[PDB]
């Protein structure tokens, strides 16, 4: 109704009420396009000038019945209300209600309130506000009250259906104003929480911006889809926490107490009388610089304690007492911390020091199962949720666009000009582009030459270089400025960018602006992005940024709002506590490095939690503000922030890397002038080649073949390969013995020497054999044989240089360290390792291009960091205390050396990883992007005054902005791009070999398909009913759902009784828990016995029954064997490992939830690929472990290299490497390897019992080692993540309903028997047209059936006849579709047919129905 | 780091010989003040007599003529925290055969604590006329050789067998 | 340090006057370091007379002006340092001050009560 505009009038209201009375005397959905909040369809055209912003009668007929009226604003916005008087006082016609309507829907009605809200926000971030803020608070409350009044003055309170209180956002603003008035006009007390209540005003932003309600709705939906994963996470965490509580209850209370006490004292009296930190240090051994006492241990592979101290289990736990497995609640906390890998290396090392190092096997399984797998499950489920929602949304938008198009179709049916053209011909794009881009790259390489200890000549050289580049840039700017119309020049965005940069540079030149050189450097550096026109990946990163700020800007805005809100609330609740309770978290009674006492630091803490580091800040917070609130706040932050962040991340991934969805460009108008110039120069150089070659010409045997075949037969035989694999394993295992303890076992030493000789001989013989059979050409045209050749040649060179005698000659000693490559010879043998190795090489080209982009972006950042922090990190520390000097004394380097001369224990010490040149810049950036060691760099950065001036506390406080911007554009955006290119490459690979798995060997593929069959079998036989009346009646009682439910409830209670065991429990509780366990065991055995009497021998059919029987057996044997271990034998460690059996029954809870079972089944189905990748990873761990031992075994025990966790033995090296496989703590291990000069090391230190001297490591090899290792491990775990995500995507989508019941199979035959009374199983194609028309639904096919019957591609046997199963399979395929079981059902039906009719001669198909009709036409 | 290794037991007459006595501390980061004594009874007599004592970077040697000269220090130099009490014999004679006792007397330094410890190490020294090569060395060398020979023989045997087989089969066609 | 006292306390002659004083210090009260001084002046610009002090244990100075009518009536570990003046006399009118130090808490607390004696 284009001309359906009608002022809502009393007569209209009378008609409404009349029709309503008509309806009520006699006793559909709203059109979503006319629904309020949306935009008016154009089918109504423009609005009459007197009709807009005025009560109009309802358009939608759905509401045309009920008492309703709408209004449209000057922006075609639809607004519904109710015609019932508001609070039975205001008729819609009344002028007051009209004016309130006029005010309400108005474009100044959002902007007003939004500006007020933003000012209120900027006023909330005030630590101690002045007294203007009182009046400002009053005025804010007044504006909010005014708005709420206008709203409840044109919508009604709750009298009808379009009223104020209906919308939940109105609930929010309502309670806001209620609390405001309460606080301001009652003024009771505890104003902290009351003022925190006033942060909900910030939430009103979400109600005043158009795109912020849809976003939170989508977030809520994505959360709602996480029920099963939340359940499984809680369950797995609880099970592992029970395990850890059993194995580690009270271990972390082990400190070593002094053996010799004086004056008749004991442990009890002492622990009763001491309360300090010094007094504790007098009796317990404390490592210098540590708040927590040294964890001793009772075993032999546990941390040892100094002579004069015995390990005893007394006192509080470390970390103020917040880390222990003493109670389920603290064990659950510790394991949640382990799942997120937050500072978990410390818990690792603390548990391996109190308990034995054999206890690491627990950490391996926990890390892998919990962290890796659970987090992958979370990512997979969130990605599925988001993907589908986005897909549905885009599809709906497309449908709406189509409808709109259809409706549109329905509606339709002097000298200046001279030198200007001169220079524009001179702009010469095919070459000047190359000129200027080479100039840009030269400028970038030129600014990357600064370092700290430069000389003046280099300084002025850099000066003239910068000036020359600036002049060239300004010259090109002014040329293009005049050549193109200045208006046209300015039109182009890139030219705006260039002009901005050049103008900033010139401003820097002219006046004294040298102060802020940061901006100069930054702006001329950003120029590198001009290469994005000819570089696809850089362009892709730019698009990922553009998408995040201009297509998903609302999601980013929501993220910013949430971070702001969390920062504000953190300041209000916890800020005062840090000032008041400061001495409890710090020894100098000054605020720590991370607090919440003002808005900036609160925001920084929220950012840290978003990055992943939350445990440490939280301990200080619990100390100053109680456990309850601190826990609640931090957990809300963690979960909600991470949810929003992952949502933003995945949105970027999908939107940006939807290249197929964004490929609509036409033919490239101009292949980049790089290509044009390349062709031009190629033509020119070919010309020059031709003319120059012209000028040059002008100026001037039956035994041998048998031997070959014999050697082939040998070197291809299975015995031979098995023997060589055995020799490989033996050789590799012999490398694990040359630890620092090799001098204690001399016989093994000699044995290993001669075994090395034998191995070398065997491998040389094998190499010669390979050459004889394979031949020289085939042997050298491989990548494996070259590896074997290199390895054996290195070994042979070492051998010959040792037998000759000229050993220890310079490089020969180093070449011996390459024996740690011998394990690499196993890659060519194990197909499992080989498949993943060849997969990784396929990814190398794609990653390399991205690695390059990442490097350029990091160079842009590292050059900035060099310009900001070049050599400002030197500090005049006190060596003994490791403490920086107050900087009030010792202001500069000269004063620090003047101190050195008089005192003795001071140093002008630089940081180890600094920004003194682009190399150390790259290293520091890596540490920052991995959040390991980032804090130490940041503290110095923000503490830096100048080049030789002593650092001062928080002088450059806002330098944190540098690291924030980095972590956002480096770590976040680069990782996004990386994941995108990787998934695209892997999709292309999987497609390339024809849609198959890339991580499994051919043998595993069959195992995988068989294990897939175990999912949803579906043919079900009944369990037999007992003949005996008595047994049968009880059998009926045994198989009721009630019995099962009761058993599940008992299992849940058993778990609860396990959870209540703590440390220091009284004997009473011990006994009663013992007896409750006894009773549970008895009832479980009983339930099993009862089923074995009712179920007879059919019990061992269901696998879960077998599991039940096994767990019953294990439980009872554990109980009795424990009772025998107590009163006969003595073993504490084995006792608890035995009692671990009772956690078996808890697993029976899986039998209930059909949701968790799918997830565990996916995990199981993704095991083989994980196994192969784990093998490759273990091999890499082994090679690195051997290199590490050989090169670092004698480094200084400084930080991360303790008495345990070193590279002195193979086990220790493996423990260290497994740790840093998760990148945790690699900064710690790398640090002591960077000492290479005195007084950081001693190169002439004699090691008792050896002949090696220096205690410091070669920095270059150390760096290379660690960085390469973390990179390779990152690649491997990315592969693992991809494997798990693919398998989950598969499993979740495998099945379909298959609602065809057996009766639908019978009716197929009863109709078959009417056309084939001879049971020949062959029907004529002519009869197919009617057979498909005689079937009942769903197998019914209506006439004309032939159009579909041809398209089903039925095969035809000789005589133009078709088989029964051919027709049956085509029909079930039509109702079910193409599911994973469809190819499986076709398999089982065929094999059941092959075993029944061995007459295969009559089954050959000669043609198909689609091919037959093509022959017909 | 510090590794406790056992000393050799065979001294070639007329030559030099180094006697090892290494005693690592439990924790390396602690600091102590060590000193030691050595005591030796001659093979064929039963009485342990002191021969030397090392403390404050000085070796005080008892006046026993059997060890007049012929003995020098080999442990830690200028450390006061020895962790290595080896001594070196020059010009070994036949009188140096017997049992050796290496008493350590460590003194750890702690926060408010001083633990005067003590360890004892014993060594047996037999003086031979010529260094007899180890049994393990010779048996390992012989095993190396015989393994080489047997694997080579199996190789050549399979080689000749397969060669005859293939040459007969190719002529069969 | 937040110290809570009544700014004015009106008590009948002859009754017992509890001078309430509590203080919100987060750190636990260590009796070996906690310090309390309860002084009394006649006017804001007059001399203060210490009458009770917590040093290791409650020390009642037994000032002649109070006879033996002063008693401690608090519990330092519960953050209460109140005093009791039994059988109040007209001469007890004046200003009473609760000074508080709770190491390692940095800030010293001060409460001031104006005691008025009614007929
Ligand atoms: C959106 C919503 C997101 C979730 C929000 C809510 C999530 C969690 C709320 C947890 C509330 C905890 C309340 C604890 C109350 C309490 O105060 O209880 C006291 C107990 C025991 O303290 P104590 O007596 O030994 O004190 C002695 C002090 N000492 C030993 C340190 C010296 O404290 C304890 O057990 C510590 C208990 C820690 C429990 C783990 C917290 C959950 C972690 C991860 C959950 C997954 C996310
Ligand atoms: C998304 C990105 C992820 C990538 C992660 C990268 C991680 C970090 C990589 C490398 C960090 C270490 C780089 C080397 C550090 C060198 C520090 C240094 O002290 O430098 C100085 C030396 C010169 O010595 P001198 O001044 O004492 O000379 C003595 C003569 N006198 C005194 C008279 C002048 O210069 C040298 O040796 C420099 C030798 C090496 C130069 C490398 C320059 C940077 C280029 C690439 C780094 C990134 C690697 C990319 C591949 C991996 C992926
Ligand atoms: C610290 C904790 C210490 C206590 C632990 C106590 C329990 C530990 C080990 C007990 C293992 C006992 C054997 C478990 C497998 C039993 C079994 O018979 O499993 C069979 C299934 C395949 O048989 P089905 O289910 O298709 O049987 C057809 C019948 N139908 C389809 C109707 C269900 O194979 C599979 O998935 C095998 C999956 C096996 C996973 C074992 C993980 C143990 C953790
Ligand atoms: C300091 C020393 C550091 C040295 C590091 C050396 C690392 C060596 C890594 C070897 C990494 C593995 O070597 C490359 C081979 O995989 C090449 O073989 P392909 O997979 O390309 O062969 C194709 C497979 N078919 C088609 C022939 C079957
Ligand atoms: C804890 C580790 C979990 C272990 C569970 C393993 C998954 C489950 C292991 O069993 C899966 C079977 O269903 C595979 O079926 P088939 O073995 O019958 O396939 C035929 C193979 N042949 C006979 C052709 C060679
Ligand atoms: C991170 C570490 C992840 C380790 C995962 C360990 C799983 C350790 C258990 O492996 C899981 C098995 O179901 C599959 O093992 P396979 O891949 O060997 O199965 C194939 C069977 N055939 C074909 C070889 C005979
Ligand atoms: C699959 C891997 C199977 C092997 C796992 C690694 C075993 C690795 C076993 O390492 C053996 C030793 O080198 C360990 O030495 P510790 O650091 O425990 O100190 C011992 C000190 N004494 C007693 C020698 C003096
Ligand atoms: N200082 C620093 O980088 O802070 C981050 C966090 N805190 C520590 N004390 N760590 C010990 C070593 C380390 O790598 O720096 C780290 N270990 C993990 N997992 N994150 C680090
Ligand atoms: C051990 O004694 C020999 C011979 O006197 C001496 O040359 C060498 O320097 C000593 N070595 C040590 C480790 O003290």
* Residue boundaries of the structural domains of chain B: 1-173
Is residue C43 within 8 angstroms of chain A, CB to CB? Answer: no
Q: Which are the contacts of A886, defined by CB distance < 8 A and separation ≥ 6?
A: none
CB C98 within 8 A of CB C22: no
Q: Report CA(A241)–ligand 3 centroid distance (Å).
A: 22
Residue A745 Ramachandran class (φ > 0 left, ψ -120 to 50 alpha, else beta): beta
CA distance A925 to A149: 54
**What three-state secondary structure class fits A64?**
helix
Omega within 30 of 0 (cis) for the link into C104: yes
Residue A72 token pair: 């449209």
CA A9 and chain centroid, separation = 60
CB A208 within 8 A of CB A143: no
Name the residue of chain A whose CA is nearest to B116's CA: A308
The percent helix, strand, coil of chain A (3-state, each to 5) is 70, 5, 30
Q: Which backbone phi and psi does A782 adopt, to 5 degrees? A: -130, 160
CA distance A354 to A351: 6
Max Cα separation, chain B?
Answer: 95
CA distance A979 to B86: 60
Atom of ligand 9 nearest to the CA of B72: 5
CB A1203 within 8 A of CB A1227: no
Atom of ligand 6 nearest to the CA of A832: 17
CA distance A1347 to A1387: 28
Q: Are strands C17-19 and B119-128 parallel, antiparallel or unpaired?
A: unpaired
Name the strand (E) or helix (H) holding C53: strand C49-55
Interface test with A, best of C1, C2, C26 (most A CBs within 10 A): C26
CB A296 within 8 A of CB A305: yes
Torsion angle of C-alpha atoms A935, A938, A939, A943, degrees rounded to 10 = 180
CA A474 and chain centroid, separation = 45
Residue A1067 token pair: 């004997």
Q: Which residues of chain A does C104 touch, with a Cβ-Cβ cutoff of 8 Å?
A: 583, 589
Is residue B146 within 8 angstroms of chain A, CB to CB? Answer: no
Nearest to B140 among A286, A750, A1197 (CB): A750
CA distance B109 to A323: 31
**What three-state secondary structure class fits A626?**
coil
Where does chain C have alpha helices with state H? none
State whether C27 and A581 contact (CB < 8 Å): yes
CB B15 within 8 A of CB B27: no
CB B136 within 8 A of CB B17: no
Closest CA of chain C from A577, distance in Å = 9
Q: Report CA(B65)–ligand 9 centroid distance (Å).
A: 22
Q: Which residue has the tokens 């070919």?
A: A686
Atom of ligand 5 nearest to the CA of A1013: 13
Atom of ligand 2 nearest to the CA of A1263: 12
Q: Which residue has the tokens 């008693």?
A: C71
Q: Whose CA is nearest to atom 4 of ligand 2?
A: A855
Angle at the Cα of A144 from the Cα atoms of A139 and A150, rounded to 5 degrees? 125
Q: Which chains have 3 or more CB–CB distances shorter than 8 Å to chain C?
A: A
CB A202 within 8 A of CB A117: yes
CA distance A1161 to A1288: 9
Name the residue of chain C whose CA is nearest to A586's CA: C104
CA distance A749 to A771: 33
Q: Which residues of chain A does B6 touch, with a Cβ-Cβ cutoff of 8 Å?
A: 744
Q: Which residues of chain B does A1204 touch, with a Cβ-Cβ cutoff of 8 Å?
A: none
Omega within 30 of 0 (cis) for the link into A1239: yes
CB C1 within 8 A of CB C24: yes
Name the strand (E) or helix (H) holding C35: strand C35-41
Is residue A713 within 8 angstroms of chain B, CB to CB? Answer: yes
Q: Are chains B and A in touch, 3+ Cβ pairs below 8 Å?
A: yes
Nearest to B5 among A259, A714, A744 (CB): A744
CA distance A1236 to A1259: 7
CB A882 within 8 A of CB A905: no
Q: Report CA(A1007)–ligand 5 centroid distance (Å).
A: 6
Count CA atoms within 13 Å of residue A1 on its CB side: 10
Q: Which backbone phi and psi does C101 adopt, to 5 degrees? A: -130, 130
**What three-state secondary structure class fits A1362?**
strand
Q: Which residues of chain C does A577 touch, with a Cβ-Cβ cutoff of 8 Å?
A: 26
CB C34 within 8 A of CB C54: yes
CA distance A1396 to A1390: 10
Angle at the Cα of B72 from the Cα atoms of B66 and B77, rounded to 5 degrees? 155
Please write down the long-range contacts of A1260-1266, taking CB distance under 8 Å and 24 or more positions apart. Answer: A1261/A1191, A1262/A1191, A1262/A1192, A1262/A1230, A1262/A1233, A1262/A1234, A1263/A923, A1263/A1230, A1263/A1234, A1265/A1184, A1265/A1187, A1265/A1188, A1265/A1191, A1266/A1220, A1266/A1226, A1266/A1229, A1266/A1230, A1266/A1233
Helical packing angle, A615-625 and A627-636, nearest 10°: 150
CA A937 and chain centroid, separation = 25
Is residue A579 within 8 angstroms of chain B, CB to CB? Answer: no
Q: Which backbone phi and psi does A1407 adopt, to 5 degrees? A: -155, 175
Residue A512 Ramachandran class (φ > 0 left, ψ -120 to 50 alpha, else beta): beta
CA distance A367 to A1280: 14
Is residue B141 within 8 angstroms of chain A, CB to CB? Answer: yes
Q: Which residues of chain A does B29 touch, with a Cβ-Cβ cutoff of 8 Å?
A: 287, 1197
Q: Which backbone phi and psi does A1105 adopt, to 5 degrees? A: -60, -45
Q: Which backbone phi and psi does A1412 adopt, to 5 degrees? A: -65, -45
Closest CA of chain A from C26, distance in Å = 6
CB C85 within 8 A of CB C70: yes
Task: Give, as one character, the DSSP assignment of residue A93.
Answer: T
Torsion angle of C-alpha atoms A95, A100, A102, A104, degrees rounded to 10 = -170
CB A180 within 8 A of CB A200: no
Q: Which are the contacts of A1165, defined by CB distance < 8 A and separation ≥ 6?
A: A1008, A1011, A1012, A1015, A1287, A1291
A928 in contact with ligand 2, CB cutoff 6 A: no
Q: Which backbone phi and psi does A1337 adopt, to 5 degrees? A: -60, 155
CA distance A500 to A291: 54
CA distance A267 to A269: 6
CA distance A843 to A1275: 10
Q: Report CA(A549)–ligand 4 centroid distance (Å).
A: 42
Which residues precede chain breaks (C–N over 2.5 Å) in chain A?
A: 27, 413, 700
Residue burial A1224-1244, b: 16+ Cβ < 10 Å; e: rest? bbbbbbbbbbbbeeeeebeee
CA distance A995 to A989: 9
State the Rg of chain C over Cα: 14
Closest CA of chain C from A583, distance in Å = 7
- Bridge partners of C38, per DSSP, are C52, C98
Nearest to B144 among A713, A747, A757 (CB): A757
Pocket of ligand 1 (CB under 6 A): A 320-322, 329-330, 332-333, 336, 627-628, 631-632, 635-636, 639
Is residue A577 within 8 angstroms of chain C, CB to CB? Answer: yes
Q: Which residues of chain C does A624 touch, with a Cβ-Cβ cutoff of 8 Å?
A: 26
CB A344 within 8 A of CB A1224: yes
Q: Report CA(A296)–ligand 7 centroid distance (Å).
A: 18
Nearest to B51 by CA among B89, B15, B91, B5: B89
- Bridge partners of A731, per DSSP, are none
Q: Whose CA is nearest to atom 34 of ligand 3?
A: A1103
Q: Which are the contacts of C4, defined by CB distance < 8 A and separation ≥ 6?
A: C20, C21, C22, C23, C24, C111
CA distance A1152 to A76: 54
Closest CA of chain B from A307, distance in Å = 7
CA distance A930 to A1274: 11
Omega within 30 of 0 (cis) for the link into A1308: no
- Bridge partners of C8, per DSSP, are C114
CA distance A795 to A824: 14
CB A857 within 8 A of CB A541: yes
State whether B144 and A743 contact (CB < 8 Å): no
Is residue C27 within 8 angstroms of chain A, CB to CB? Answer: yes
Q: Which chains have 3 or more CB–CB distances shorter than 8 Å to chain A?
A: B, C
Distances (CA, A) of A176 to A81, A144, A181, A486, A1156: 24, 9, 9, 54, 41
**What three-state secondary structure class fits C117?**
strand
Is residue C33 within 8 angstroms of chain A, CB to CB? Answer: no
**What three-state secondary structure class fits A958?**
helix
Q: Which are the contacts of B41, defined by CB distance < 8 A and separation ≥ 6?
A: B47, B48, B49, B98, B99
Distances (CA, A) of A510 to A403, A463, A518, A520: 61, 15, 16, 13
Atom of ligand 3 nearest to the CA of A243: 1
Name the residue of chain A whose CA is nearest to C104's CA: A583
CB A966 within 8 A of CB A861: yes
CA distance B124 to B98: 6
CB pairs under 8 A between A and C: 14
Distances (CA, A) of A1320 to A1329, A1330, A1357, A1367: 19, 18, 13, 14
A1014 in contact with ligand 3, CB cutoff 6 A: yes
Method of determination used here:
cryo-EM
- Bridge partners of A876, per DSSP, are A908
Name the strand (E) or helix (H) holding A566: helix A553-580
First-to-last C-alpha distance (Å) of chain C: 35
A963 in contact with ligand 8, CB cutoff 6 A: no
Count CA atoms within 13 Å of residue A874 on its CB side: 21
A356 in contact with ligand 7, CB cutoff 6 A: no
Ligand nearest to C-alpha A1230: 8
State whether A580 and C104 contact (CB < 8 Å): no
A1106 in contact with ligand 3, CB cutoff 6 A: yes
Q: Whose CA is nearest to atom 22 of ligand 5?
A: A1007
CA distance C51 to C66: 9
CA distance A929 to A907: 30
CB B73 within 8 A of CB B59: yes
State whether C104 and A589 contact (CB < 8 Å): yes
Q: Which residue has the tokens 């976003």?
A: A215
Is residue A732 within 8 angstroms of chain C, CB to CB? Answer: no
**What three-state secondary structure class fits A434?**
helix
Q: Which residue has the tokens 């008492």?
A: A67
Q: Are chains B and C in touch, 3+ Cβ pairs below 8 Å?
A: no
Residue A1175 token pair: 């093998």
Distances (CA, A) of A1021 to A774, A1013, A1017, A1024, A1104: 58, 17, 12, 9, 17
Q: Which backbone phi and psi does A523 adopt, to 5 degrees? A: -70, -45
Q: Which residue has the tokens 């220091």?
A: A1064
**Domains of chain C: which residue ranges?**
1-119
């Amino acid at each position: 109704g284009p001309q359906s505009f009608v002022h809502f009038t009393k007569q209209s209201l009378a008609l409404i009420e009349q029709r309503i009375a008509e309806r009520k005397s006699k006793e559909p959905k709203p059109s979503s396009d006319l629904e309020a909040g949306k935009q008016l369809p154009f089918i109504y055209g423009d609005i009459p000038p007197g009709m807009v912003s005025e009560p109009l009668e309802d358009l939608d007929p759905y509401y045309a019945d009920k008492k309703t009226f709408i209004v449209l604003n000057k922006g075609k916005t639809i607004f519904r209300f109710n015609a019932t008087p508001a609070l039975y006082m205001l008729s819609p016609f009344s002028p007051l209600r009209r004016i309130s309507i006029k005010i309400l829907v108005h474009s100044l009605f959002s902007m007003l309130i939004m500006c007020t809200i933003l000012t209120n926000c900027i006023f909330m971030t005030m630590n101690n506000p002045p007294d203007w803020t009182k009046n400002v608070e009053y005025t804010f409350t007044g504006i909010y009250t005014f708005e709420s009044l206008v709203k409840i003055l044109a919508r009604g309170f709750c009298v009808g259906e379009f009223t104020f209180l209906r919308d939940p956002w109105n609930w929010l603003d309502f309670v806001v104003i209620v609390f405001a008035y309460l606080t301001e006009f009652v003024n009771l007390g505890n104003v902290s929480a009351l003022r925190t209540f006033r942060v909900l005003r910030a939430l009103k932003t979400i109600s005043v911006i158009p795109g912020l309600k849809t976003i939170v709705g989508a977030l809520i939906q994505s959360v709602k889809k996480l029920s099963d994963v939340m359940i499984l996470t809680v369950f797995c965490l609880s099970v592992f926490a029970l395990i850890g509580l059993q194995l580690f209850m009270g271990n972390l209370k082990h400190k070593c107490f002094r053996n010799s006490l004086e004056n008749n004292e004991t442990l009890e009296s002492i622990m009763n009388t001491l309360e300090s930190e010094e007094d504790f240090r007098k009796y317990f051994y404390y490592l210098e610089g540590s708040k927590d006492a040294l964890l001793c241990g009772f075993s032999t592979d546990s941390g040892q304690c100094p002579e004069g101290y015995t390990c005893v289990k007394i006192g509080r736990n470390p970390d103020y007492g917040y880390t222990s497995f003493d109670t389920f609640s603290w064990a659950f906390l510790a394991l949640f911390r382990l799942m997120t890998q937050d500072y978990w290396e410390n818990l690792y090392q603390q548990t391996l020091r109190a308990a034995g190092k054999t206890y690491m096997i627990f950490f391996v399984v926990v890390i892998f199962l919990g962290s890796f797998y659970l987090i992958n499950l979370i990512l997979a489920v969130v990605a599925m949720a988001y993907k589908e929602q986005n897909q549905a949304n885009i599809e709906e938008a497309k449908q709406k666009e189509l409808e709109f198009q259809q409706m549109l179709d329905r509606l339709k049916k002097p000298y200046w000009i001279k030198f200007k053209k001169c220079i524009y011909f001179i702009v010469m794009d095919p070459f000047v582009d190359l000129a200027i881009t080479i100039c840009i790259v030269l400028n970038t390489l030129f600014m990357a030459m600064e370092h700290h200890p430069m000389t003046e000549e280099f300084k002025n050289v850099l000066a003239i270089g910068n000036l020359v580049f600036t002049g060239i840039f300004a010259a090109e700017m002014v040329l293009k400025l005049i050549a193109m119309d200045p208006y046209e020049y300015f039109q182009v965005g890139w030219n705006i960018f260039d002009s901005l940069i050049v103008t900033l540079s010139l401003v820097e030149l002219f006046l004294a602006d040298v102060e802020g050189l940061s901006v100069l450097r930054s702006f001329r550096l950003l120029r590198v992005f001009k290469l994005a026109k000819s570089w696809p990946t850089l362009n892709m990163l730019i698009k990922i940024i553009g998408n995040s700020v201009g297509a998903l800007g609302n999601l980013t805005l929501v993220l910013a709002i949430i971070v702001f809100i969390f920062a504000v609330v953190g300041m209000q609740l916890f800020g005062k506590s840090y000032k008041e309770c400061v001495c409890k978290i710090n020894d100098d009674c000054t605020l720590p490095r991370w607090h919440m006492n003002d808005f900036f630091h609160s925001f920084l803490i929220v950012f840290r939690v978003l990055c992943g580091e939350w445990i440490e800040t939280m301990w200080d917070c619990m100390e100053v503000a109680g456990q309850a609130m601190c826990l609640i706040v931090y957990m809300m932050v963690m979960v909600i922030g991470n949810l929003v962040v992952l949502n933003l991340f995945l949105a970027l991934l999908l939107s940006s890397f939807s290249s197929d969805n964004l490929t609509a460009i036409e033919e490239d108008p101009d292949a980049n002038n790089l290509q044009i110039a390349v062709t031009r120069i190629k033509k020119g150089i070919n010309y020059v080649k031709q003319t120059l070659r012209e000028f040059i010409l002008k100026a001037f045997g039956k035994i041998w073949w048998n031997i070959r075949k014999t050697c082939y037969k040998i070197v291809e035989h299975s015995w031979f390969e098995s023997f060589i694999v055995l020799m490989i394993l033996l050789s590799s295992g012999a490398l694990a013995f040359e630890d620092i303890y090799i001098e204690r076992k001399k016989t093994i030493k000699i044995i290993l020497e001669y075994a090395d000789k034998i191995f070398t001989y065997i491998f040389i013989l094998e190499m010669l054999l390979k050459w004889i059979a394979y031949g020289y050409k085939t042997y050298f045209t491989n990548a494996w044989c070259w590896l074997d050749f290199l390895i054996v040649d290195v070994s042979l060179v070492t051998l010959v240089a040792n037998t000759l005698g000229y050993s220890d000659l310079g490089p020969i000693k180093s070449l011996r360290t390459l024996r740690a490559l011998r394990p690499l010879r196993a890659l060519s043998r194990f197909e499992g390792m080989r498949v993943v190795v060849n997969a990784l090489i396929g990814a190398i080209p794609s990653i390399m291009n991205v690695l390059l982009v990442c490097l350029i972006f990091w160079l842009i950042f590292s050059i900035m960091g060099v310009n900001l922090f070049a050599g400002k990190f030197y500090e005049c520390i006190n060596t003994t205390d490791g403490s920086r000097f107050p900087a009030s004394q010792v202001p500069n380097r000269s004063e620090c050396f003047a101190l050195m001369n008089v005192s003795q224990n001071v140093r002008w010490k630089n940081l180890k990883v600094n920004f003194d040149n682009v190399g150390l810049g790259y290293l520091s950036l890596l540490q920052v992007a991995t959040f390991k060691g980032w804090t130490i760099i940041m503290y110095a950065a923000v503490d830096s005054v100048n080049v030789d001036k002593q650092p001062k506390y928080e002088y450059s406080l806002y330098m944190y902005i540098y690291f924030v911007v980095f972590i956002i554009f480096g770590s976040f955006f680069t990782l996004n791009l990386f994941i995108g290119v990787i998934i695209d490459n892997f999709n292309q690979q999987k497609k390339k070999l024809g849609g198959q798995d890339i991580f499994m060997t051919e043998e595993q593929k069959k195992y995988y398909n068989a294990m897939k069959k175990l999912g949803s079998k579906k043919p079900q036989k009944p369990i037999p009913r007992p003949g005996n009346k008595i047994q049968g009646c009880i059998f009926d009682l045994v198989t009721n759902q009630a019995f099962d439910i009761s058993i599940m409830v008992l299992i849940c209670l058993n778990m609860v009784t396990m959870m209540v065991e703590k440390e220091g429990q009284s004997q009473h509780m011990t006994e009663v828990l013992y007896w409750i366990n006894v009773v549970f065991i008895i009832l479980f055995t009983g339930e099993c016995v009862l089923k074995l009497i009712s179920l007879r021998h059919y019990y061992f059919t269901v696998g879960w029954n077998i599991f039940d029987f096994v767990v019953v057996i294990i439980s009872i044997v554990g109980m009795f064997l424990a009772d025998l271990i107590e009163t006969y034998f003595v073993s504490p460690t084995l006792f608890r490992v035995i009692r671990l059996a009772r956690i078996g029954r808890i697993l029976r809870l899986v039998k209930g939830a059909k949701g968790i079972r799918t997830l565990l089944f996916a995990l199981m189905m993704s095991l083989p690929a994980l196994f192969n990748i784990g093998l490759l990873l273990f091999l890499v761990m082994f090679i690195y472990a051997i290199f590490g031992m050989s090169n670092f075994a004698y480094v200084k025990k400084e930080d991360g290299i303790n008495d345990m966790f070193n590279f002195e033995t193979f086990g220790n090296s493996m423990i260290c490497l497994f740790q840093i496989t998760t990148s945790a703590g690699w900064d710690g291990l790398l640090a002591p390897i960077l000492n290479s000069k005195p007084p950081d090391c001693d190169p002439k230190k004699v090691h008792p019992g050896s002949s090696v001297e220096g205690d410091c490591g070669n920095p270059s090899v150390g760096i290379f080692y660690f960085v390469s290792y973390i990179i390779i491990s990152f690649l491997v775990v990315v592969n693992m993540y991809i494997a798990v995500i693919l398998e989950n995507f598969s499993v979740a989508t495998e099945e379909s309903t298959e609602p065809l019941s057996e009766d639908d199979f019978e009716m197929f035959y009863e109709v078959w028997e009417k056309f084939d009374p001879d049971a020949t199983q062959f029907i004529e194609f002519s009869k197919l047209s009617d057979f498909a028309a005689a079937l009942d639904p769903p197998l019914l096919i209506a006439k004309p059936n032939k159009v579909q019957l041809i398209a089903m591609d039925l095969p035809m046997v000789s005589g133009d006849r078709i088989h029964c199963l051919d027709i049956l399979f085509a029909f079930t395929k039509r109702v079910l579709g193409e599911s994973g079981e469809m190819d499986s059902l076709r398999s089982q039906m065929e094999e059941r047919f092959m075993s029944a009719n061995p007459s295969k001669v009559s089954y050959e198909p000669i043609t198909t129905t689609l091919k037959r009709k093509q022959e017909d036409v | 780091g510090c590794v406790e290794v056992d000393s050799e037991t065979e001294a070639v007459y007329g030559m030099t010989f180094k006697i090892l006595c290494i005693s690592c501390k439990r924790r390396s980061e602690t600091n102590a003040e060590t000193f030691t004594e050595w005591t030796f009874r001659q093979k064929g007599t039963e009485e342990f007599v002191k021969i030397l004592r090392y403390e404050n970077e000085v070796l005080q040697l008892e006046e026993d003529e059997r060890f007049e000269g012929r003995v020098v220090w080999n442990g830690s130099r200028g450390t006061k925290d020895l962790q290595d009490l080896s001594i070196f014999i020059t010009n070994v004679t036949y009188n140096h055969s017997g049992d050796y006792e290496c008493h350590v007397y460590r003194l750890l330094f702690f926060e408010n604590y001083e633990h005067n410890t003590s360890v004892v190490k014993k060594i047996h020294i037999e003086v031979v006329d010529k260094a007899n090569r180890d049994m393990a060395s010779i048996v390992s060398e012989i095993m190396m050789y015989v393994l080489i020979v047997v694997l080579t023989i199996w190789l050549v045997a399979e080689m000749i067998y397969c060669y005859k087989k293939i040459a007969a089969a190719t002529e069969t066609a | 340090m937040e110290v809570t006292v009544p700014a004015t306390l009106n008590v009948l002659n002859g009754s017992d006057a509890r001078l309430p004083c509590t203080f919100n210090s987060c750190y636990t009260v260590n009796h070996k370091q906690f310090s309390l001084n309860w002084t009394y002046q006649e006017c804001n610009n007059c001399s203060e007379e210490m009458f009770l002090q917590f040093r290791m244990k409650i020390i009642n100075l037994k000032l002649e002006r109070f006879q033996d009518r002063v008693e401690f009536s608090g519990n330092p570990s519960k953050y209460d340092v109140s005093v009791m003046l039994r059988n109040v006399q007209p001469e007890d009118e004046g200003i009473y001050n609760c000074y508080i130090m709770n190491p390692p808490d940095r800030h010293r607390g001060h409460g001031k009560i104006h005691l008025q004696v009614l007929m």
